[PDB]
């Protein structure tokens, strides 16, 4: 009897509290596709090759559609593709937006607009000489663009302001300040959904639309209670437009945090129990600092979440049997992934870096990150097979492209935590397209068994059709 | 013939009047998950370890989103986190809300507002000197906060009042009084759903939405009869926002009390026959004093109901096979559970207490309550197995974490009430991750059988996939 | 055991990065129909036979419903059916539209109207002598006709202008200019959906409908934010009305480009992973110049996409097993297909040419393009058939219409990339309707197998019911 | 092994391009009904018996509800029932409508109204001496009636007009001229759906509804863009109200023509690939002259389409497994069906003629058209038998009503084109209701087989339950 073992996700035990957790594949994305007796395979995440040299670690990215080019804030410089454009202060993640005439950056509590001519302005009140209203423009937390106006949220006071129509360096003359007020507090983040300005506080998300006022002094934005969601976000960068709405990480104000996707007046959880355990392992800080982004390539719709010790990628295309989460990492010892700020330009996906002043372009026919071999794990779930005495562990691996006959460590665990002997089998060989990755004799399963299936290589890893002979 | 036995809910007989009741697992939550041949396991509720030392028993808790903190009323003091910020009179349960500038407590019929600057005020009528309308302000029953206005229900006269926008310590100048008015009486509780003030009476639930009127004397709230629910609440704390609406315990004015969740003008029953019997056991009093809370952790969506003798937890994430209720208790003699007022902050869930002046932090890797060993009960439904002989009673447990090889009392019932001989099997062992909790020989089934499967532990208990060999 | 091998879509491995890709049929369309034990067959694309001689290569086509005739722009001439009716400058693709009194061509930043009375006008500002408003009428990108008004998009400035009701040669006197304005940039293309002017930018698509305002200077078109889509188009000719909405190619601004179909406020993906890889193989240029068109015949609803090296046809009527894509080509060495600008007039589908100054009429009873034989491929997917020892490779073919006993090359790959020896079998002979295309002996199957099934013909090729005996 | 052979629709090969086509039953209607192990039968189309001798070939028909009679334009006369009530000029198809005081015929570009009192008037402009508006009344293409007003389309000018309320001989005093205007051109046909005037052009079908305006000059009709259909019609008589909306033959302006039924803003295709090929066999001419009609009898809903060489009938009440088309013909050599202009009066279905100056009434217990023996065919789809010997081919026929023992020609093809030997089997006998149409010895099937099953008779043919023994 030949038995197939699912490999898109495994099961194990958390030795800290003896709870059943999910072993997520490392550096492997699940592609659901009927190939041969498998209906899906697993492919290594594309490697990164050095492309440009920047000032420092990346702090922001955005695909400007006005200039049709990628703008990145890395280190202390602002770039338009490769050419430096200006200077940026601060040291942390910065908010970015763009408009008809300038690229705006929210940094260090300032809304700094770099115009395409070459002039750098800052958002500030109208001069007292002009008969225009003066607002309490405090610090700046997050900025967006809508209808030819920059809308930015003041730091922790439940207020936001929109710039004027024909002078973007100053707010609107009469009515520029708006508030949520369907909450005690919370303006943590701000975005633009379709034509609504979305204010994500804590335990509240609100939508504001244009009212089309004509008299001076009237409010130009009105809340829509029919679309408000009773949930917040953890930090100012714990949100992103994922598919057609916003996917975010919930604030601790409504319970234990988890990943949600906005529906219509409600949020639908996307994180599994294991993902929620990983998130809960973080404090309020180290989670308010998480960065969420989205990627799209080869029918893959990925949501990437970076936290100070993890990088979790959720696939919306391979979630036919529940959410599909994988863990990205750099090196061989669970070091946090190095890529960040993915943006697709021309015909290539370009990413920044978290520790060096470099930028990579996500090559597809290699798996090495800046010419360094990487580790891919593929766990199999536990199952009870008393006295099975299994044989012929076969995996279908797509070979042919590599630099060396890189091998594979196959090992078995009997308790769900502790793995035993590791066997090294050639899983690939350059310029050969018929390999038959197979281990003939495996042990006798006493009560439980699980398989590890680790690979370390600089080449793409494709695996499918994991099967055994149970007899 | 190997047969699997469900553990999430057992059957039994009620010896008082010979009825078929359900045996609800004690201190165990059912997590649905494909473990191995089981598709779900049962995990002990996390234990409580002392965190702080308060003035007295807990009287309320609320997550202040304006301050991003947790406010607890315990004993006679009000705490922000761990440090006192004021003194609260009275001894019973109090209502808590918070706004931009203050934290309001409805206690002893007074809306006492503690401002963050150090000023304690009481909501009272406007001075007669001011040219503002004066209202007959009675005792305060329940309070809530919406759009910067405290709305509070006066005791038992079907009236509620909203405070002024520019002075929270006084009611609104011109139109501050409203009446549900679609009911002969009843304002038992108040709350805010999304943007509507929900007023729960006895045998009715009304929604009030903002009119937006600007002229003086015009009502700022209009009833939405389309959303009216023809059911009430038993007590002023017999309601809680559960998932996206309010879940409550119905008032005797509409028949036998039971647990409902509000849909869209409709209430869907959540309680089963056993829960209805448990609720009906108490009088109208001891139901008016019930408490309801909500917890959310590891995809677990628990609705907790505290009563004078029963603490019942309904899991909304494991109700696929019908509602899933469990019983939480302290000690080995069905004493009521001690933890109360659960609230998550930072990365920990903290709970008050019902008898001692302490606050615990709900540690997960232990199962004891303040270093006191706990009793966990499971049950299997009665089945007719005439002349069958049971062997190889296997139960799968994830062992490994324990300070003692805690044992397990297995016993069988043949009539559904009385359980026979009790046998001790080592169900756990320190630092051993494969145990195979098993009993070789079970007796011959005469007519019926059920199993007890009691555990006494200080460490987490995980159990799944009970099976027997019926032959 | 007789096993059926589908040929609607094969499977293989890319030899540059070892990824599992699909193998689309070449020059074949899958017609779903219960023929015999098959439920579908595959028929060659109709061949092209020379119809007319024109000035140059095709640059645009349209169906003037006012004149009830096909207008083509080939080389430097504009033809109404056969006879030329004007001259068109430039060298690239031109936009076409028509109305009651003229045929408008958008070319070289100009809106040139050739009127049916024989005279040629051009869209230009109203003379300054009149009191009518003057706009900045720069270059043109895309033009459309709706309600007797020509609406054209200014090149790269987000603005679009409409003509006048009584004078199509000049814009509207008072309010002729409109903008999307819910976007940093993008006016890439313009169209008319049902009664709305649809503007496709980068990462946004907007809809405009008639207001009905009669006062001077009032807006005549209003944007409908409810119908907007958060996606753009890759180029100005990367869109076509397919069924009841616009099928387009997404712009690199929203991520990796692919093929979408607009629904109601959202875009439904169409392209498969292999098609997305093929699209991604192209840069921003050589993708913005791609063309898309729609064909309809014999219930076939084809969406054709022309790129510098690939012509991809998507069949909407045969997409019950997922999207159905095929590749068209000219010659035997995967060149770009020469037929372009299909339009059905009278009872014939007439098409232009990409390399010569000719026009074909798409004969159905042949398959040769301008009396030149073509090559069709029918791959079958790989499968694991260890030691199968297959026999009796049968394909059911409808023969009889042939000018020679055309053969068929049958070959098998054992890895998905490299194919073996080719055996020639008569799949056709003139004036015979019983042929039994069959190969008796096929070799033992080692691990995998796939069949190529290539034909080179001047005659129609119909194939169905590919089967083997595996024993 | 007894196998049932379906007869509702066979399959064969068109030898011009060797393409699989659906062999439609000739003069046979499929009637779904559980008779015996068959679930449906096939009944001969009822024969035509001469009723009246008119002035010539029929040109139009309409059921006048105002007079509760039938108006037929045959030859040069207008007939009310049987009697002649007027004279009509021209020789082609005319348009019919009827109102409160007249029967209106659109012919020769003129709207000629025959009033019930014997007055023949023509729609014409008001005399200039009046104070009412004068329009540019061109020719008349199609006419209809709604709300007491005659609405007619001006030929080839995308405009239509409505007559006056109190004087149907002149257009409305102030606002009688309306224009589609959401289309380059095309007013091919006009009708009324329920209360909406439906204007069918090329590529557009629009709806106009009452405005309710009372002032002079205001538009009585406003376009409803929410119901527009983006498909035209081939000719002025290529549309009929089928069930609740209009079934129509699409214009070549939108691609290859087909048959559609209007839904809600979209047209649902009804034709199959074979019917699309049959339609495409004709040019734009010879298809503009196609005439559509509807029939209803015995739970049979029939859509009849007349072309110069094909009469195709679609049965909407027998389309559970797909469209059910049949071919009607006169004589033995596929001459076009003579019957035309079906209309139900009293309890007789009455039809005109295409060649003779007579009118028939569709007798139900015969099958001859004017005492001429008719031909019926029932093909069987091709199935691969591959060395199966066939015996005992039986068919269930309900005999009894005949004047002679009519015989049936049974033959079998092996390639779908050329048929074999013809065997004559008595399929009917006068006053015998138990016949057992059966043929013992059929040949050996080499590869494929199909059956022709032709019956030539003057009597009704009812066939069902065709079965054969394959051994």
Curated annotation (Swiss-Prot), chains A, B, C, D:
The gene is 10. InterPro entries: Phage_P22_Gp10. Keywords: Late protein, Virion. Acts as a tail hub by assembling onto the head-to-tail adapter protein gp4, generating a channel that is sealed by the tail needle protein gp26. Together with gp4 and gp26, gp10 is required for stabilization of the condensed DNA within the capsid; perhaps by plugging the hole through which the DNA enters. The keyword DNA damage does not apply. It is found in: Virion. This is Tail hub protein gp10. Monomer (in solution). Hexamer; assembles as a hexamer onto the dodecamer formed by the head-to-tail adapter gp4. Interacts with the head-to-tail adapter protein gp4; each gp10 monomer contacts 2 head-to-tail adapter protein gp4. Interacts with the tail needle protein gp26. Interacts with the tail spike protein gp9; binds six tail spike trimers. Transmembrane segments: none annotated. It holds the Pfam family Phage_stabilise. It comes from the Viruses.
């Amino acid at each position: 009897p030949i038995q197939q073992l699912p490999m898109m996700k495994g099961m194990g035990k958390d030795f800290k509290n003896a709870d059943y957790i999910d072993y997520l594949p490392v550096n492997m994305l699940a592609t659901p596709k009927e190939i041969l007796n498998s209906s899906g395979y697993l492919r290594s995440f594309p490697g990164i090759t050095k492309r440009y040299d920047m000032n420092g670690v990346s702090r922001g990215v955005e695909y400007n559609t006005a200039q049709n080019a990628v703008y990145r804030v890395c280190g202390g410089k602002l770039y338009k593709g490769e050419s430096e454009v200006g200077d940026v202060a601060g040291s942390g993640r910065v908010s970015m937006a763009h408009g008809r005439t300038s690229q705006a950056v929210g940094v260090n509590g300032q809304l700094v607009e770099y115009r395409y001519d070459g002039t750098v302005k800052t958002v500030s009140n109208w001069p007292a000489d002009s008969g225009f209203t003066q607002y309490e423009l405090g610090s700046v937390r997050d900025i967006t663009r809508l209808r030819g106006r920059y809308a930015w949220s003041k730091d922790g006071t439940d207020s936001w302001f929109i710039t004027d129509l024909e002078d973007e360096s100053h707010p609107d003359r009469y009515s520029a300040q708006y508030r949520a007020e369907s909450q005690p507090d919370g303006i943590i983040g701000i975005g633009t959904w379709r034509d609504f300005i979305v204010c994500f506080g804590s335990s509240t998300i609100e939508y504001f639309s244009l009212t089309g006022a004509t008299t001076a002094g009237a409010a130009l934005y009105v809340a829509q209670p029919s679309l408000m969601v009773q949930k917040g976000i953890a930090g100012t960068y714990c949100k992103t437009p994922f598919a057609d709405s916003y996917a975010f990480i919930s604030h601790p104000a409504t319970g234990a945090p988890s990943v949600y996707i906005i529906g219509s007046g409600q949020a639908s959880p996307i994180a599994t129990a294991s993902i929620e355990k990983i998130i809960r392992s973080y404090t309020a800080e180290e989670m308010a600092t998480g960065v969420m982004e989205t990627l799209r390539f080869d029918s893959h719709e990925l949501l990437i979440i970076h936290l100070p010790r993890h990088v979790l990628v959720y696939d919306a295309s391979s979630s036919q049997n529940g959410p599909q989460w994988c863990v990205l990492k750099t090196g061989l010892y669970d070091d946090v992934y190095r890529g960040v700020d993915f943006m697709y330009e021309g015909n290539q996906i370009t990413c920044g870096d978290k520790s060096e002043a470099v930028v990579g372009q996500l090559q597809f026919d290699i798996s090495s990150q800046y010419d360094k071999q990487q580790e891919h794990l593929l766990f199999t779930p536990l199952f009870k097979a008393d006295n099975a005495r299994c044989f012929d562990l076969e995996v279908e691996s797509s070979t042919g492209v590599a630099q060396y006959a890189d091998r594979l460590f196959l090992s078995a665990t009997t308790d769900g935590i502790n793995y035993g002997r590791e066997q090294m089998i050639e899983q690939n060989e350059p310029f050969v397209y018929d390999k038959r990755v197979l281990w003939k004799r495996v042990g006798r399963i006493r009560r439980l068994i699980g398989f590890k299936l680790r690979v370390i290589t600089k080449s793409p890893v494709t695996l499918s059709g994991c099967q055994i002979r149970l007899e």
